[PDB]
Design a protein around this nucleic acid. Structure first.
Ligand code: ANP
Ligand code: ANP
Ligand code: MG
Ligand code: MG
Ligand code: MG
Lengths: 372, 123, 422, 308, 379, 353
DNA sequence: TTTTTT
């Protein structure tokens, strides 16, 4: 009776929802949290006790009586909700940022957008500024990696567009390759992106390219669910030595809105694809079969700036794989690891996002940059 | 106390033994059976209640108390024994015929030879 | 006593039923639902408490007491009932639509048809109207994908006969949507998914290339009582050297029952009501050709290119297309917003009414598969003395071996000859 | 102990039996249900409530006490019993047919015959009649697929003797090759038998011999078909275990059979029935069912009596 | 109420933390520890009962009430924390050593450094002293293995730098090959390092070098998570034998901060790479493919001192793979196995850390010592 | 309170220990037993009630209270301990034999050494003397397999040293080859050694010699954990080669390999590896590192009671006395196995060139 | 139990 009243009052705040995947999400700490190994409903019951009258709050201090309320709530939830339907919203721990407006929402304003994923860190409004001491450093680094020259204009724009796709929660129909020689800044960009977007970024293996995706459990493809960025690295030169070709059909399945594959001990075989897939390579990719359907899904961005020690400065001037040689900085790697350029790079990504959404945003292939 | 006494009295009949593999063998229906295929210790506890005194029989009609007696029994069994080692024997469905005298021990004496295989006919 | 009385009263409402597989189906929110990892019976007990006396409703506010009533109810369900026996009923979240007539039933009138699946969304009467701009846009899109010409008349009709995804009955044929790139094969899939909702499922290619066993196979178990199954993409079976389609799976995907169980479940049997469609840029290749396999394969072809202005010239200079049109970049977002859901549903119902004369069935197209070319000629040429050399020269006197060389080589060698020419 | 006394009276009904497979079978809803999941003993305890004294029935309304009675019952079953012993019984989904006698033991008189596999359909006696048009509607059929004419006499005797053999709950140690050509009516036999014994009939392919064995327990007939000519082989090391198994293994072919290696012992386990006389929509509509059932019963009191 | 008050008081001490991996870490005996199949919250509740009022401590003697307090505590933890973010802290079983300065923190000072790994043994302040009879023997051993001559200066410096990099919790950019002939002391160094750093050290098979790293469960990769030193031993003769060559792509994957691979019955495919990877060999490595990226991630240390028996003393002085011959000490492996030079070697490693980690320590390649790289060096 | 007092008193006896590998070990019946599938702690609680006061002992008869005591004990063990750290101790089913003094410990003295393995049989202190005709008769099979001549002194001493090495719980730097013909004494030695040490003995095939240790489950190598002797019995007529890298990997103290369905990849190597060979072995690659890890014991004495008497465990405590005597003879004070690269025909050319 | 392993 009294515990039923507590459960009914809790369910009136719309703080617990059941999703189409048969899962429970709870609104705690200005975030829609989900976990099948944690007691989230009882966590919400304990945390929400301050919104209840004094005769009810003291009743919820018993772990046994919170489970009764949890059971009462679980028997009350029949309908399901869609969740994750807004592509123009970027979720954080303490709210949601509007990518079309630039305004940060918190409290019940962010509750309206049911986002079950987040960057994993808190949004700071005093660093999302266009004028900082770190912004000049970040622009110098990025202009070093991708120069602003007439000969490098489409490559730089494609680089910016691919980096800004990682903010959009939608399916994308192209796969991009970061191609270049050694010490050209391909991993620096990846680390900067990981710092910027945090938990919306995932690194997976090459098995999602060269193997089947739905024979038995496959966490490497099942962990990409609702992720906005997937990275692969170190393509093993499928040209010269003994190797396995990529697979033309694997590429086509990775551009679909739904990807088939299940985790361990799981019956769920469908994953929603919101990811920009980028592969770091030192060699151009080689496919088992070449087709017009494969040509429409491949884009290439080239890196042609060398960062070297002075001793190796002379040898880099003779290599034709490089267009510019610059002095290497050994403090950059540690400064990126400390999330120094987190919000500056986030501001840059949002600024490019506003630039490249000319009504709609569409990724386009570059078939001319593939020897095959 | 009373249930521990009942478990101790049952343990004196050597009807339950522990094998080295990590299982128990129960002497029920004049045959050494195996656990891991339906629990047989509580069946034995229920079937032995006649030999126990009268005040120890009404306590064993309660399923929960039989589980307590079983838990007591599984704690007093610490030494493992081997199964079917005697090379001179021929089991039957009333006993195990010897291989030298031609004698055919049955019942109480057939329990000494812990055998799991048998010929298949009476004697 | 009192809890047993409550369970008895709840049982007399016929809101809980037991199926042959062993599932428990509950009538909640005007729909039949079953779920092995959701406490559905206690949900129904909590929901139905308002139809009981006042002294009985108070007993149902305790979750401990509802479990006793649930156990009591589970002990009285001793007889199984047959479910999903009406092929011409389309279940929604709030009722059932009669396909042959067109009346929408709600409440106890839809409870009579035990439809244990659903589309997942409510039926709207004001959108099932056929008179709306969405209908005109949808008709234009469909006519673009499959033009209404004399040369496409037989192919457009097979495309229309999509309407099989509404039938709750076993289908005896598997369909391949075969075409070149950017021909609208995924647009049709997305439209169908929007139209029928949860009755649509997407699985992997292992149901065509792997062995179906008694082990946990969610890719098969998730097809139970589904009316549409899509498998996307198919590798090139020659230049890639990949696994071929096993002929035994084609037979087992046509039977009314399929074998496969979920994880942590014992439900080994699945009921087959699905239309199987495979999206392909390459025509299928099988590991063993026989007369039974050639009776279960049909092919629909897509030959209209939707291209950007830059690529119009190469599109018009290609022999894989008959028509070149301009790509629309806003259509994909509109389809995902369920803009054409009810218009496409109305179109599918209209097509359904056309192909029941009075029985609808799927006809294979064996002449569209190059892999089946050899067996057709042999079947129409031979009827099951006669020297081997004489047969060789007689069979090579008319045919050329520039392509059918290995075919006759295998037929003569492996298949050794009571065969008489027509 | 009141609950132990309640459990005593339930075991004095033989409604729960223990099998050597390690599971229990329960006589509920007039059927020997055998299930490894879902509580059947508790269902039986709740259902058998009315055959119990008044004070013993009120105790069984509590699930907690029903589980205690279930535990008591499970602790008193020590000896296993064997199922499906009688070979002259036909399990239908209403009861049991006593072949060599003529009567259907309808609802409760069929508990002594612990049958776990049924034909899957009900049985009646108004249509299971010793006359009427349907008896002659197939006389022409059974006589033109197989005539006798004193030249095809033994052939027909074997034909409708190995047909009636698919009614015996004992091992049929013989593999009758249903020889003949196409359109001779061996598919009419195929459809008349699926319409006679229901789920007691199973179909298979060539793999059973040329190279479907787990799900052949208490299967009373197998009718392998769609076989290509061998001239793999019969794999002569297969009949050793194939005929060693409650089914009449019938192989129908359109070609000549070639064994892996014929010896002096191989040609003693093979029979043959030739068809030297080389519907649908109505044969699949179960028009006869019970008529063909009578035909098989008629042939049963023949040659198989008193031994086959 | 009362148990909730106990749980709230326990929570205020910050002795239970939830990590961004699903783990619960507790602070027992001056160390952060966790166990996936043995939750340690009730053990902390029992151990911390002496910092509470005497009326709250008796209630914690009941195992059933400890479970209630644990249930209350689990509902209070909502946010996660990041662990192992300090590269210059060496965690022990009873505290943390600061490599920058040299002080040892053995209390709440060691608590702020959330280190989930440790050497596995306690730290002794009376043996981390420098001047000792054991340290003089260690100097002799190290000087025998790597002499301080003018022709071995760069090799000895690279050896010291590679050894001292094993104390750092950061991603390294090179894999080192300890190359030498038989009985040259390249296993004595490995045993000394294992004695020095304890559980921060791991051995793995050669499959991490020659096989695909993510084709199913790979326990040989998931065991390198957060380890500061990984050893591989005895690659075969790639030339005068039929053997699988290394693979240039695995070398590049073993350099990145994050390594992809999962254990058995696991859905976690990400591991943090903090390890110095050393392969001890009698033969020079051979790779599938040679490019500029591979030649930038490999360094080689040579071992050229032979420890022999009087019988082979003359045969060793003739062989040209050795530069010096010394008498073998048969009672040396036992001394190492008893951890005699554990803290002397720890002090030596800390001194080398001070010498080489100013301001930034970075490993550099040695391409000139690989014959396989000769052709690419010609141009 | 009272149950916590009982648990505290039980914990003071150090009868329950937490191990580095993650398991619990309990001291029951003069042995350390692993808690992996049975409730051993409750068994220990029930057994130890006789060392408790009369008020604490009448309370351990209830199975419910024993579970409470076990729960209390499980929360008290926070620090793990290291096991099997004594190379000069031989464990049995009833205690530890000291290989130096020859003394035998059975009860509270035996538990001081945390030995998790054993021979699998009971020790007989009455036949471990020196005297009695059994031991005097056992100096007729050994002296026949390896005569006591002057030309066979070095080979017999190497044979005795190799047999003695099986009693040491430490890492050995060499692998021994028993080279000879059929029925020459090798199988008799194998059976005598199996009888003498029991469960500390293992027979394998060729999966650890010709194949690759890593890359998949290797149940035959994780089985060699903490075991003192391994025999490679059935050598095929060399086919796959010896793959000297494998024998190099079998010398290190730690061996890399995992069982089925397991994540542990590290094993401790205390094994004396003896390979029974009848034909000249062929190696994939021969280098100076291979020469340093190979020893050869040759059997060149051509020969029904000696077929079941050994199988009846008759020479179980007589061969053990010889092994202990030879152990004492070859510890001066450190026993080390040395290579014999001249007794291999394949190593003839590589020595000179 | 499923995964892992075959
Ligand atoms: N009627 C139409 N008018 C305009 N654009 C259309 C029309 N139908 C489809 N499109 C668009 O054309 C593009 C290509 O169609 P799509 O459905 O991808 O064909 P596809 O065959 O699946 N491509 P592929 O997988 O390479 O064979 C998509 O962006 C569609 O939105
Ligand atoms: N400084 C030293 N003085 C004396 N003996 C030493 C010294 N260092 C090592 N040894 C001994 O020399 C022997 C050979 O050392 P070891 O570490 O095995 O070299 P190794 O190169 O690993 N042998 P290998 O694996 O075949 O190449 C061992 O017995 C060591 O105990
Ligand atoms: Mg890089
Ligand atoms: Mg498509
Ligand atoms: Mg070494």
């Amino acid at each position: 009776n009294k515990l039923f009243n507590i459960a009914q009052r809790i369910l009136d705040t719309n703080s617990v929802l059941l999703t189409e995947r048969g899962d429970h999400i709870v609104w705690i700490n200005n975030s829609w949290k989900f976990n099948s190994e944690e007691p989230l409903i009882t966590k919400l019951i304990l945390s929400i006790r301050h919104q209840l009258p004094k005769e009810y709050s003291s009743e919820l201090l018993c772990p046994r009586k919170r489970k009764t309320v949890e059971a009462n709530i679980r028997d009350m939830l029949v309908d399901s909700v869609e969740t994750d339907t807004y592509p123009d919203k970027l979720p954080f721990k303490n709210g949601v940022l509007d990518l079309v407006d630039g305004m940060f929402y918190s409290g019940d304003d962010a509750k309206k957008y049911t986002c079950t994923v987040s960057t994993g860190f808190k949004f700071d409004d005093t660093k999302f500024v266009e004028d900082s001491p770190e912004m000049e450093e970040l622009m110098n680094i990025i202009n070093d990696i991708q120069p602003l020259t007439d000969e490098n204009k489409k490559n730089r724009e494609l680089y910016e567009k691919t980096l800004s796709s990682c903010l959009c929660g939608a399916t994308k129909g192209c796969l991009t390759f970061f191609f270049g020689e050694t010490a050209t800044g391909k991993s620096t960009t990846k680390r900067l992106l990981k710092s910027a977007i945090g938990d919306l970024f995932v690194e997976t293996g090459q098995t999602i390219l060269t193997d089947v995706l739905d024979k038995g459990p496959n966490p490497f493809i099942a962990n990409m669910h609702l992720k906005r960025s997937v990275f692969c690295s170190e393509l093993p030169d499928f040209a010269c030595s003994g190797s396995k070709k990529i697979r033309s059909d694997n590429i086509k399945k990775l551009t679909e809105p739904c990807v088939i594959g299940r985790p361990c001990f799981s019956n769920k075989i469908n994953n929603r694809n919101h990811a920009t897939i980028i592969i770091d390579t030192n060699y151009k990719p080689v496919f088992d079969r070449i087709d017009n359907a494969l040509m429409r899904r491949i884009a290439v961005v080239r890196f042609r700036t060398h960062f070297s020690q002075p001793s190796g400065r002379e040898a880099a001037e003779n290599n034709d794989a490089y267009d510019k040689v610059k002095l290497l900085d050994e403090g950059l790697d540690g400064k990126i690891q400390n999330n120094r350029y987190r919000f500056a790079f986030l501001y840059l990504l949002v600024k490019w996002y506003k630039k490249y959404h000319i009504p709609i945003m569409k990724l386009y292939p570059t078939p001319e940059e593939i020897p095959d | 106390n009373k249930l521990f006494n009942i478990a101790q009295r049952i343990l004196d009949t050597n009807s339950v033994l522990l094998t080295e593999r990590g299982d128990h063998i129960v002497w029920i229906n004049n045959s050494w059976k195996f656990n891991s295929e339906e629990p047989l210790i509580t069946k034995l506890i229920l079937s032995i209640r006649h030999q126990l005194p009268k005040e120890y029989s009404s306590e064993l009609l309660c399923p929960r108390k039989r589980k307590t007696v079983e838990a007591n029994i599984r704690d007093m069994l610490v030494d493992s024994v081997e199964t079917d080692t005697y090379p001179d024997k021929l089991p039957f469905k009333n006993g195990v015929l010897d291989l030298v005298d031609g004698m055919f021990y049955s019942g109480d004496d057939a329990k000494k030879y812990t055998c799991t295989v048998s010929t298949g006919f009476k004697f």
